[model samples]
Target: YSDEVLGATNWLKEKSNQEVFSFVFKNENVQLNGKDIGWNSYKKELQEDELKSLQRGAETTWDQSEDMEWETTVDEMTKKQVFIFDSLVKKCLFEVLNTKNIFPGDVNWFVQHEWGKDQGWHCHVLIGGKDFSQAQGKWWRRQLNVYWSRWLVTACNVQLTPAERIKLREIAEDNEWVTLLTYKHKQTKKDYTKCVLFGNMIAYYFLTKKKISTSPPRDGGYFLSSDSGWKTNFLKEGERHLVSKLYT
Candidate 1:
């Protein structure tokens, strides 16, 4: 709500062209000097989640009836505030495995908790590798979330057809790609704006095509298992894995 946080969100969602970030908390409060304890500092609430179990349980299937606390928390925060927390989740763990030489380039990340877990306390990651002979697993990356959000929006588009698939075998074979259509691809003040729109058309269709093709039609879908070089594969290779539920 403060001007400080608003500027940070504006930069993340809008000025991403800069290639970096710097921001602290998005909100604050007065001293416990005003709370029910009146400065007692005694009942500091704390509850730690089962990170290990939550991570493993999520992969097995997913707990059915428990309310997801993350969503509950987000229900009250601004979209901008959510961005900070999500990426903070993104940052803390990403750096950990990254430094340990576990990650390759991009990551396939899932944040969740188990059925009896205390909080939404775990995430699963299938890090990239030459061949995880050691064992494991974004256009296809970014696209997952984009369509995920779209699914929610489309709950309203209920009657609309799934967007036509983009980059079909023939289409991928014929076409190729960039950013800043008027420029980056040239040079102008308002450049990436157009390309973001342009690239999105390709994405929207790709997502819908995957959506309707699925049994349950989860918006969080992906085109590659090795979602590694997915940018080139999805847009450049004309690869579509609709059959065999390959479009996970």
Candidate 2:
């Protein structure tokens, strides 16, 4: 749109690391502690459909409107609907990647997804054997549901409930790894801002100096590709005023 937008993009690109993982949020004010950080833990417990069920339960409970719909695709190898079920897949991957204990050998979990409110998707996660009971994983899951629900409220500047803060503290204490979310779009010339308050003293997470597709496998989080390979784009294309530049 305007060079000002590029200024924000350039400034952000210089402050992020695409190689590293990044967290996403709708806006600021929400603190990036354990619960918020652990929000990504809403993943699958099994390799297939089991984990998907847990998330489904939550969606059923929350989605009373019956607005959510199911999406389908022909190319899907496993018949897993990316738009609907991919939600569960992403959750599962997030947990396994985030929580070392949830990984294989520790009683692998599976996750899937179902529709409910249409706008708010459902989650289906299946936690495995002793691990579920060992670390009170089930208990943690219940807490996670509430934490996720509550944090979502804060995202919209809504007031937090008693249970919300309690659950948030639990997650924050258990998991402290947090970071801001950002990206760059050269074509649209749009600068995305995920004002997530993080705990670490880090600057930014990623900058898209290259045009990357926001699709599966790649994630399209942030990166700049060239003739050789991928590189991190970092630069502010503005002087706090008429910013018009690309960080690559």
Candidate 3:
């Protein structure tokens, strides 16, 4: 791989194995704005065998199928499968640590949700034990890998080949966080573009950034209203609590 590709892969691997907790979950396991609207919600929108196929992970292969068409059925099935995967990860964690007397309260985790036509829906999680030092020990490392291997079945779990990594780097674009890194321009209070390359910015984007949907929208929305100078009912009680916990 080229230097940029090699750098990106190394950065990803570093972040993935950090002492922090990292996990991915599917759309079904997600609760939107504190509303439990995943698989149960989709049940009203999919077929019986379709739901079964999804739960059994049989429909996960359609993304690479030739002449594939996007259908709501497939979409819902993917959502359901992701939910199953999420549960599997949680269960693996539970089983692996049960003998150690670990409990949910012992874990600290946050979720990042992503979804699209090409990628379906899933979560990337960062989790850590309350005792971070213990989590970094050899026993925990072995158990963590075993749990991950047993539960993380998404094709994404596999490492990309060098050629694929090179292609990914070729098409990678800087997101706002990267371009905005030039704040203040050293007391000039003016904007300036840093002559930086993609390697560093791409690494920073994936390794350190957190994107979330808050209230009205992901890109452009307000927790507080601007028109009436009021608070919108975009967030529920549970959502408010979670936002406070995660962001504040």
Candidate 4:
């Protein structure tokens, strides 16, 4: 581990509110142009599973592996989620740094709907502390990780029981909230794993940061802790990182 990692752990001892409400779905409308409209209307109609299904449909269609599903609703939401998602990342970054007045700079991002030969609609996102030329714009540099649960199975193209696969995300996202935690050992370094469990979705990125345990989880995504307190769970097989970096 480096100074930043050491510093991050010291700082990680404490964390944000521990939970945030799902403001995105709280009410059906969000203000725009000083006028109230159904921005989340179509989006609100979706459950997290549907969004991923929509996402997968969109992906396979792009790759010619499958067909694209309806997007009228997804269109509004991804833009909402993609943009809203980016905003939350910034807030989480700042929220973590704000506590210690520790060193941190700007957060930057990129978004595209394009696809690649092996890639689905997976995203390439960059976020880190910035300096002068290090303006948020400097994040234009490539090569990091493709985030998010949306493409978890696709990132490394992990292989799992096709039947078991559906249940994985199904169980994971079924949570009421996302718990924020980091690895206490070797892979547990970066100050980067800030998650916001809004709606039925949980947020994560930088695939490199997660350390998979064995194979994965159980019923509804969690096995009860012997105590009421949070507990550790584990793994993702082979190139597939499917297990628990996420536990409450």
Candidate 5:
């Protein structure tokens, strides 16, 4: 069986300040390096669940289980790496949520993935929102430097030499990408950060709030649908109908 999860990201560049993404994978073994191989979809799913698993405050939902893979696979190595890479993408998201104090609440997850060898499996992240940008301000950037240093140390499990750490950091610096504040509102370029944050905050509450009210109230649990802008009731707009049960 196949599973999928999707959500809007940082913000759209040209049209709207919103991004969308989906992580898809299968549970059974097919092939690997001309040999049959199997992956622990349960474990992969668990790891893939880093978003909701990591952050209690963030919004998320499982889209559906597919009978067939709509997205095609070219080779086995690619699948193995893609699996791990997507796993990292989710982990990066979890890390952002875990570092909420550093980034606050302006985090939206969006990724663009393409296949390659040197770059291998990867995606672009647009981390927007006022609180999100503020969290990633000058001080936070410095903190990222320090975090990288420590992360490298631990990521290597103390086995990486100084040269190795430097190499890894170089690769990470180049490969892992994020455009925090590329797009700004025409009215207020300066408040781009806050605007994105406000949009995301509204989306956040919209997802977890359960009760619907006329006025924007915060007492109820809600689900975030594409439309309704910001409200307690959930509604999905402009999406496929195959995955209703999973998402709901």
Candidate 6:
């Protein structure tokens, strides 16, 4: 056996509870020369997921949001508060997957957390399933909407009676929208327009692409002339923000 298969078998050996007929390994972390890798590896994971969806021939669904009331509250606070909010949202998301079985049995999902314009945080989530079209159908989308909305209400401590919960269920069924704007719309009774569904092009653009800033001043480019943009902010003049020019 080769080293790759040897390592995989070692992991399978540790998990003796499951009957291991065949297994495929997906590495979440890799190391070489005592240093971590960069953007190239990141994009590879995205590409792998894209190919998985393509092979499954499933409709890919994407959504983004920073419109939760708690999200707004976190924006005004420090990173500590933001961390807590992120942790809570992750906990709820995990529960939605495991307890609620929203994306059950080897459903492929890709998610990334990013900072929105005003320092608020949001997530871009993509999901594809084994059934190809079933995961993207209206019935599953309705369940997705309800799972998110119901949890948001519960998380915010918004008091709701059994009757009120039933009423909201009715609305969810009658409204028939894919993306739910629970707390997002409740704040102003207006439409929350940030949530979007991605086309194949859009999915590849956002989910599989790398990003760069308008300027790179802290890497001793403070004095270098460039046409990209001028440096106006000096929040951390001496510190360097990690960047990679590596392309796959």
Which candidate wins on TM-score? 5
Structural similarity to truth (TM-score) of each candidate: 0.22, 0.24, 0.33, 0.22, 0.38, 0.33
lDDT of 5: 0.33
In model 1, where do residues sit more than 4 Å from their true spots?
A: 1-74, 78-82, 97-122, 131-248
Error of 1 at 85 (Å): 3.3
Could you tell me the lDDT of residue 84 within candidate 4? 34
Give lDDT tens digits, candidate 1, residues 205-228: 322332112222224432111122
For candidate 2, report its TM-score. Answer: 0.24
RMSD of each: 22.9, 20.2, 18.8, 19.2, 14.1, 19.9
Candidate closest to the true structure, highest lDDT: 3
Q: Write one digit per residue (lDDT tens) for candidate 4, span 1-248.
A: 33423332222223212222111101122233343333222222233553455444333322331113422222433343333332322333334345436354332222222222332122222233333122222122110111122233222122456654454334323431122232244665542333332111221222123221112211122100000011010111111122112211
Worst 10 residues of 6 by lDDT: 224-233
- On residues 93-204, what C-alpha lDDT tens digit does candidate 5 reach at each position? 4464566653433444443233222322233333444344343443333333344333332333224456655655554344323223423456654532322332343333
Q: Which run of 10 residues does model 1 get worst, by summed lDDT?
A: 20-29
User: TM-score of predicted model 3?
Assistant: 0.33
Query: Model 6 off-target regions past 4 Å?
Result: 1-105, 115-121, 157-247
Ranking by lDDT: 3, 5, 2, 6, 4, 1
Error of 3 at 238 (Å): 12
State which candidate, 2 or 3, has the greater lDDT: 3
Off by over 4 Å in 5: 1-71, 102-107, 116-120, 128-130, 133-162, 174-248
lDDT of 2 at 217: 22
Candidate number with the higher lDDT (1 or 2) = 2
Native-structure RMSD, model 3: 18.8
Per-candidate local distance difference test: 0.24, 0.31, 0.34, 0.26, 0.33, 0.29
Candidate 4: give the clashing pairs. Answer: 212-235, 213-235, 214-235, 235-243, 236-242
